[PDB]
From Swiss-Prot, chains A, B:
Lineage, broadest ranks: Bacteria, Pseudomonadati, Pseudomonadota, Gammaproteobacteria, Enterobacterales
UniProt name for this protein: Soluble cytochrome b562
Cofactor: heme b
Start-end of Basic and acidic residues biased regions: 47-60
Full-sequence range covered: 23 to 128 of 128
GO biological process annotation, one example: electron transport chain
GO function term, MF aspect, one: iron ion binding
Family that this chain belongs to: Belongs to the cytochrome b562 family.
GO cellular component, one term: periplasmic space
Gene name in the database record: cybC
Subunit structure: Monomer.
Cofactor binding annotation: Binds 1 heme b (iron(II)-protoporphyrin IX) group per molecule.
Annotated function: Electron-transport protein of unknown function.
Binding residue positions for heme b: M7
Organism: Escherichia coli
Amino acid sequence: ADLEDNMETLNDNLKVIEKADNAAQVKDALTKMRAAALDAQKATPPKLEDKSPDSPEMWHFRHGFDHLVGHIDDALKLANEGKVKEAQAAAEQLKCHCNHCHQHYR
Amino acid sequence: ADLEDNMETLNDNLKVIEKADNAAQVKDALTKMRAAALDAQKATPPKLEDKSPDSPEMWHFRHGFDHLVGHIDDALKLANEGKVKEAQAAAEQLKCHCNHCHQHYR
Ligand code: HEC
Ligand code: HEC
Ligand SMILES: [Ca+2]
Ligand SMILES: [Ca+2]
Ligand SMILES: [Ca+2]
Ligand SMILES: [Cu+2]
């Protein structure tokens, strides 16, 4: 599961959550996203391939995933309570977490 | 203040953070946005003036500001720490969040 596969998994499950019909289906997609993010966090992006692994830039990159994961966890709390709509809206605001790391690192 | 003035505070102080040279300027600008975000959170926006205060439509409106304040706080830490270029880049990233709430209720 290389980084590009993890990104597709994130991308694919956003679509799943948008057309989901109950909070349990959003929960399932959010959990798959959450593991794809933690798996993605392990990797090194191409835009930093020759920088040092312990660099400030690799830690900034790794922290972008903690910011995304914490949004996923906030959405998971709504899904687990059955608030399908509110959790669907939550998953929509993940888009900015995707973008904030994308600018400087994609 | 009313919602529009708070928004003016948010919009002008973003540009100020963009043009500031030192950390005391970013911090001062970030602090005004924080109070304006928390004050705007209490308002009802026109495009929702006929719904009811505990709808998932206006749950979403208030939660947008908790998330905005959280990122202003990330930027304030960096400023307080003296990383002007990093606080300036934290603050530029708020606009994705601005535009997301805007797409819905502006
Ligand atoms: C950093 C902390 C990131 C976060 C959060 C998200 N993404 Fe990402 N994404 C990132 C990088 C460095 C890259 C490039 C990797 C490469 O090998 O080029 C990507 C790429 C994508 C892609 C395209 C993948 C490809 O085929 O090259 C997609 C579709 C994508 N990212 C989607 C996506 C979504 C939906 C996110 C939030 C839910 C998201 N990413 C977060 C880095 C980071
Ligand atoms: C919801 C959670 C919002 C967030 C986050 C931000 N804004 Fe906003 N904004 C919101 C509404 C409902 C409105 C319309 C209010 C109205 O009475 O029309 C706005 C409007 C603005 C405007 C226009 C102000 C005007 O001239 O009438 C500006 C310039 C603006 N907002 C800026 C702005 C910025 C820079 C933000 C984040 C950094 C931001 N807003 C966040 C709702 C929400
Ligand atoms: Ca690539
Ligand atoms: Ca459907
Ligand atoms: Ca106006
Ligand atoms: Cu965020």
